Swiss-Prot record:
It comes from Homo sapiens (Human). It is linked to Aberrant PTK2B/PYK2 expression may play a role in cancer cell proliferation, migration and invasion, in tumor formation and metastasis. Elevated PTK2B/PYK2 expression is seen in gliomas, hepatocellular carcinoma, lung cancer and breast cancer. This is Protein-tyrosine kinase 2-beta. Transmembrane segments: none annotated. Most abundant in the brain, with highest levels in amygdala and hippocampus. Low levels in kidney (at protein level). Also expressed in spleen and lymphocytes.
Amino acid sequence: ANLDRTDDLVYLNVMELVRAVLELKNELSQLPPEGYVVVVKNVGLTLRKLIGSVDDLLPSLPSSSRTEIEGTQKLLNKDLAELINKMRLAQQNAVTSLSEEAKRQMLTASHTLAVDAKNLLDAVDQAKVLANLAH
């Protein structure tokens, strides 16, 4: 048995992103970029919405973990900045060998949205708990 307790709602939403972004990492070699343009939305709209959940805990944390939240919530909008910019540039009507390299690169940016989230789900976990230990 396990008496798990859901207190942090920051690692909950982000969880949906890591999944929605992980599916587009394997489908890269399946469907065209025309359909991915819509996926990046549900993959990048999960962070911009969850980021507003930790912002409230920011002022409720010490001066040690903040570097993680204030440093992750800012880069969270950069992990997709290169992914999207690569979509409109990859799916574009380009007649060159690069058209192939621009397909594998875009994917390298997708995972970024997750790789930068795994550290965020645990980052806040240390800031929230500190809110209590602190006076």
